[PDB]
Structure 1
Amino acid sequence: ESARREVESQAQQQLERAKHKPVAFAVRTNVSYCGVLDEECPVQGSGVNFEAKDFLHIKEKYSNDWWIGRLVKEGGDIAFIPSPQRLESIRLKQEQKARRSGNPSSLSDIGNRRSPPPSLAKQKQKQAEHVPPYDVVPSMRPVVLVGPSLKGYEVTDMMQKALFDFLKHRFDGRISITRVTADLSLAKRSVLNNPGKRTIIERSSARSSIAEVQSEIERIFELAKSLQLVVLDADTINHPAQLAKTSLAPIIVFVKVSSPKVLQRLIRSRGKSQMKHLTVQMMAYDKLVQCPPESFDVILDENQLEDACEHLAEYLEVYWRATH
């Protein structure tokens, strides 16, 4: 067929001209698949070998089943991503290769009950949870500081404040510092079509502060869309679990005390107001250290300031170059 080869060259010429175009948005995956073995790829031999929890930077539009995108790997190539509707077609192929996919058990029972597949055997049913295969994400995952204790205190707010002095100096003109006043741990997506849409409903959600949350969330989407990082100073997030289920999924930059014994020595050197909060400060520290290592992306446990700055700077420099 001449058409398949002609459209392949036509797509490649479109791919070649797409290396100098602005980035629109990004997507997040949660399932393992190979994009080269699929027969629906517009370009053959240039598929994507992505895995679970992989981020793709979609810039332009191609069709309703494939989207042009780029990975986060250094020196990568422009690839294609199946659409959630297209992913819905390829996921049905996985469960059809087995003996059965619906209700009828095939335990040596053939020829008596044909059992045509009902609606429960398809994706129309099973809508109690309906986890979305693809979650839309900003251009880059935000970087935030978590721990080692309750935010806002003299010991904790001041220590993380010292980091942002170095981050701004090194990354002038490419990152921005923003103070997140509103809460972020209550970012829900599958609660309602538009909770608290109007301020005159006089409802429990409408009159509360839930409405303000979405304004800050959309502010993050816009600022991150400009291909620039975001620096946040929210004082209501103390554990990584409060953002793992969130569709934002920021990078967890971990700062920790080397030993719990020396941690309480820090509080005793500040002032009488701090030892009053030392009782609750220690309780949060223990609940944070035993978090799984895979929940942390950046670590900062050195006792020296210089090694603390360059550990984050190297990762930021790598991430900045990663998207290009």
Structure 2
Amino acid sequence: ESARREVESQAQQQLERAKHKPVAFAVRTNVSYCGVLDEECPVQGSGVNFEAKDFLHIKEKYSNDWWIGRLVKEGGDIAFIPSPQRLESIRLKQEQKARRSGNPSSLSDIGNRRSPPPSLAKQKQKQAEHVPPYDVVPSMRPVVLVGPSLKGYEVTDMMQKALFDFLKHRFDGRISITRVTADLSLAKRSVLNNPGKRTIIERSSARSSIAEVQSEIERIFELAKSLQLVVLDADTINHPAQLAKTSLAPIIVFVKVSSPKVLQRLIRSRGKSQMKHLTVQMMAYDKLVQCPPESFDVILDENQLEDACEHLAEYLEVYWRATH
């Protein structure tokens, strides 16, 4: 069989010739589908059974069917992920041979209407919300440090300025700080056809913050190509709910305040004034912990900075190195 042998090793050589090739963009998976029955690849690899929202960033402009790539971990080896159209057209192929996929039943009623199943069980409609396959993210992951209360309110960011000092000490060679005065929790690029771009065009969505809140999507995303989670001051996420829907999916770090009794003297130590909002700073705080991490999967229950900063350090100590 000259056909199989003459090409099969094509992928093996081209994923190692430019071993120093620089990665770009990113991928956020949703289905870990194996490849013993779904190989269809020149790499001869087993499959793409990685995870939902897997960690790998890819730029190799391969054919219109599959995308040979790289996985970021302790090893800097090369990987493989199917092209977005491949996962789109095959997410029904794994259910294409599902016999009664249209409407006929196998419940002893064989011959009622018969006929091939309707085309609607394909990508002819698929109109839940027209949600695409794997989503990109920056060359790094954006950062959120939720806690202890509504950011910018006395103590709130003062728990972050101290946390950003050793951070910038470990960084500054890694640092990529920015301060965003725009609401990502009120920002979603899933607009219908075209977001607002003009200024006085006299449209129904002209005097909207969407124009100046999507403008820093470019200040994030592929701008992170030099590798950097990119922290921010965003007074946007007081709960990991609105942020973790779109392609952002940020690094959510939760500084724990333990029981709702140590923050009393933490916020009342300044005496008068600080209770302008009263409840929320001690209500929005446990309104966060309320839900599970996974988003703020990072938790920071720790005393004086000396070891408290270590939790941030050890997270990014492995993370930064294992990303090349």
Give TM-score scaled by structure 1 length.
Answer: 0.93
The alignment partner of 1:224 has SS state of: helix
Give the drift of 1:36: 5.7
Give the drift of 1:288: 1.0
Give the drift of 1:96: 2.5
* Distance of 1:68 and 1:241 partners within structure 2: 33
The alignment partner of 1:138 has SS state of: coil
Give the drift of 1:56: 1.9
Q: Which has the higher strand share?
A: 1
Give TM-score scaled by structure 2 length.
Answer: 0.93
RMSD of aligned alpha carbons: 1.8
Give the drift of 1:9: 2.1
Give the drift of 1:47: 4.1
* Distance of 1:35 and 1:142 partners within structure 2: 31
- Cα deviation digits, residues 63-119 of structure 1 (max 9, x gap): 111112222322153121111211123212222233311122232122342232223
What is the match of residue 40 of structure 1? 40
2:104 and 2:112 in contact (8 A); partners too: no
* Distance of 1:216 and 1:191 partners within structure 2: 16
1:168 and 1:176 in contact (8 A); partners too: no
The alignment partner of 1:164 has SS state of: helix
Greater CA drift, 311-320 or 135-144: 135-144
- Cα deviation digits, residues 196-238 of structure 1 (max 9, x gap): 1222222242112110011011211242123233121111221
* Distance of 1:114 and 1:46 partners within structure 2: 37
* Distance of 1:84 and 1:108 partners within structure 2: 39
Give the drift of 1:281: 0.9
- Unaligned segments of structure 2, at least 5 residues: none
- Unaligned segments of structure 1, at least 5 residues: none
Greater CA drift, 240-249 or 65-74: 65-74
The alignment partner of 1:231 has SS state of: coil
2:56 and 2:71 in contact (8 A); partners too: yes
The alignment partner of 2:306 has SS state of: helix
What is the match of residue 72 of structure 2? 72
Greater CA drift, 135-144 or 46-55: 46-55
* Distance of 2:189 and 2:181 partners within structure 1: 21
2:15 and 2:69 in contact (8 A); partners too: no
Displaced runs of 4 or more, over 4 A: none
- Cα deviation digits, residues 138-194 of structure 1 (max 9, x gap): 112122201221111111011111111111111122221111111111232332221
Q: Which has the higher helix share?
A: 1
Greater CA drift, 55-64 or 38-47: 38-47
Q: How does 1:265-276 map to 2 (within 5 A)?
A: 265-276=265-276
2:68 and 2:80 in contact (8 A); partners too: yes
* Distance of 1:48 and 1:237 partners within structure 2: 33
What is the match of residue 89 of structure 1? 89
1:23 and 1:57 in contact (8 A); partners too: yes
1:175 and 1:230 in contact (8 A); partners too: yes
* Distance of 1:94 and 1:317 partners within structure 2: 40
2:32 and 2:48 in contact (8 A); partners too: no
What is the match of residue 304 of structure 2? 304
* Distance of 2:97 and 2:77 partners within structure 1: 32
Q: How does 1:210-289 map to 2 (within 5 A)?
A: 210-289=210-289
* Distance of 2:64 and 2:263 partners within structure 1: 55
Count matched residues. Answer: 324
* Distance of 1:242 and 1:113 partners within structure 2: 46
What is the match of residue 171 of structure 2? 171
2:174 and 2:228 in contact (8 A); partners too: yes
* Distance of 2:250 and 2:137 partners within structure 1: 10
